[PDB]
Amino acid sequence: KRFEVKKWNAVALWAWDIVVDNCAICRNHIMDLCIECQANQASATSEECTVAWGVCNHAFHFHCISRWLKTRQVCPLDNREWEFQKYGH
Amino acid sequence: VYIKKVEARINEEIERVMHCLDKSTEEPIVKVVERELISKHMKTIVEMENSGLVHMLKNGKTEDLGCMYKLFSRVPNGLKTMCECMSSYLREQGKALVSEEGEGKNPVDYIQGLLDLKSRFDRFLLESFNNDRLFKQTIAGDFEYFLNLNSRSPEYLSLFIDDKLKKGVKGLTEQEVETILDKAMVLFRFMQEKDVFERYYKQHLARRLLTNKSVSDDSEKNMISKLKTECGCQFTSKLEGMFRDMSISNTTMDEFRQHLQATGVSLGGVDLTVRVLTTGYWPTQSATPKCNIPPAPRHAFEIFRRFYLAKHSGRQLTLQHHMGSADLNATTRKHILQVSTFQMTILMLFNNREKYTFEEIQQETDIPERELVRALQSLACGKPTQRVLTKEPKSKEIENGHIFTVNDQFTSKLHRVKIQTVAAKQGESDPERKETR
Amino acid sequence: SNSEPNVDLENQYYNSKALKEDDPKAALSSFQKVLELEGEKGEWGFKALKQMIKINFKLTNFPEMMNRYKQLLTYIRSAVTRNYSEKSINSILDYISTSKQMDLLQEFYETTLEALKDAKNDRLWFKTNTKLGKLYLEREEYGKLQKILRQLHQSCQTDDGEDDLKKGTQLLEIYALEIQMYTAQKNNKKLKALYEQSLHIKSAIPHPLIMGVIRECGGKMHLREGEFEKAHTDFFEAFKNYDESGSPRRTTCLKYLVLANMLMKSGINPFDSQEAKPYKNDPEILAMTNLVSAYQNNDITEFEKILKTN
Lengths: 89, 437, 310
Ligand SMILES: [Zn+2]
Ligand SMILES: [Zn+2]
Ligand SMILES: [Zn+2]
Fold this sequence. Notes:
This is part of a larger assembly, with chains A (89 residues), B (437 residues) and C (310 residues). Chain A has 89 residues and is of the alpha+beta class. Chain A contains one helix and five strands; from the N terminus they run ββββαβ. Chain A has a three-stranded antiparallel β-sheet. A two-stranded antiparallel ribbon of chain B has the order 4-5. A two-stranded antiparallel sheet of chain B has the order 6-7. In chain B, helix 5 packs parallel to helix 7. The chains are: A alpha+beta (89), B mainly alpha (437), C mainly alpha (310). Chains B and C meet through helix 11 and helix 12 of B and helix 1 and helix 5 of C. Chain A: Its EC number is 2.3.2.27, 2.3.2.32.
């Protein structure tokens, strides 16, 4: 051939996995309510309880981390400070 | 000359009253002598501005400042107006230097002149004022006042620290580099709007790390130490992640070196230097395109992605093209070219078959938008007499049906010749400036 | 941007690089001619000396290898001032480490030590010190490892103070070497002292391998005292840093972290997502996953069965 590649210095980026099948604070599911709410109805008003995402890309219920954040603040799956990056899924 | 006369008058009066009138009348007389003379002196020095406080500080008379500090310290309310006029002169000097009207000023020279003024005033303070707290407080408060007059002031500081960090050509040693950074952060201490400060510094970090290496590789540890001692749990944390990525890049670099040594099932077993970063701290570089890859690099990329997903499992990789470089071995001698992961695809298609055009490289490539032209014009348009990709329809604007050829260009006898069309002027243009604001 | 480096010097440098594959005899002379025709230092000549050192180490030629390394050390101070010059010698230092002539290793180290001291580049001098400190730490040598720590601490001393804010990078490098050193002798009195001296003044950079070691020391100290949360929070980070780096101690501290998460009576699955599957289904780690699974389900009979089984 006329031109042949000898060296390459590509940069590889990566992102964490989440395993969205169950959160770790209550062990019910990523959706379908939490332990503090049980049923869909009974004063939910369109179910004001959604999924919250942190900077570390972990996902739990909004209320579950809220009870977590009052006592501790250290995102029990890593040692990031668990910023707030999203609300809902 | 009055200050020498009043000091002599005070000295002769206190000497006479302590000798001709022993220890009897020394206190009331000297008190009157200091009071009215110093009141005259204070009004004399400030308004004279001819060997006056403004003038005698402008020309740099160390003795005049020194003898005045030792004279005005005796009577109260002397150092108060002394610093007030000193601050007023600093305000006048600051406004004449931070003047924004008029385009065509060198930002690196502007900070250098400002820092020279700070060093000059600090030298005067040490030599004359004997490190008085009141003088230090007034200049510190004043420096907080005339510096934040522009919303671009932290941006100008950020580019200056980028200029001082891109290469230490001025001050090859380290002793003055330590002082030049210490003065930089001291200047940064009396500055507000810290959020915009790192937002450009982080952009400067991206600009200095996503380009050619070999800038410091050691002074990075010094900046973060200064940021840690200056800030808390803030954008310095963004700088923390930036450093982690460099650590992971080299650890994976040697780890991949061991695995390419094992061989056995290596498909693309050629020279690779692959870096690993995290998206959590590097800002948006570009759209991260998904263009094609030449087959030999494809096998090389397939090894790393398979390997990085096996022994570094749990995380998947994403491919991108607006980053990196390469060394294309061409072949009367064998001179290796340079392609910044932009012209690899176009030149590889030429190797398969020459006599292509714009249609060929846009239809059988899955190429992204107009950014292709900027990469494409880097070899043909705006080229000096070192052209590695010539065309028959010589024109400025880009056509569709135009054929590409290659020229030997013996003038570029450089063995590892590089085409550094990118990074022509790192200047932080307005469109990114406004959106980041 | 562009900048004319040099036309001829790069050509003959790479021409001799084509000659190193072709019977390195007379390639060294060609490299030497390039160095002679370079005169003042030389950027291409810096890499040429690096290549000559690499070639001479292949065919066991040490005498001029270190003499040219002294020239390489002097080349560090003037033209290639900060740059990748530390990356070059780190690769040179790692390339010398390939063989087992440990006497030549520390002759090469000690000559490096004094040369970097001259340029006030003690910045590059601790990097050699820590690599020698880590090497001594692996081989359980403390006679000269301590001398390195004392010299580094003295360099860290700001006369009146024994620790510097900007030199906090060297505090952690000193403490990390001391952390695993006293781990060998099980010195709890020193281990707590090292961690306490670390936490406050160290913070300039969480270097992943060093930060994980510092946290791993803290987790052992805290759990040896009784603080479950603090012992939690330390391995709670050490596993993060180890994962990024890739040291074999990733699973070692993860086992400690999983036990620490159990001890604090935590009601949250620690294996959920960061462990994912590589660190949740690793054979011995998966055995630990069954334990915390029984912990969640409060299966006392099953838990004790696994304890006796494994
Ligand atoms: Zn849940
Ligand atoms: Zn709910
Ligand atoms: Zn999380």
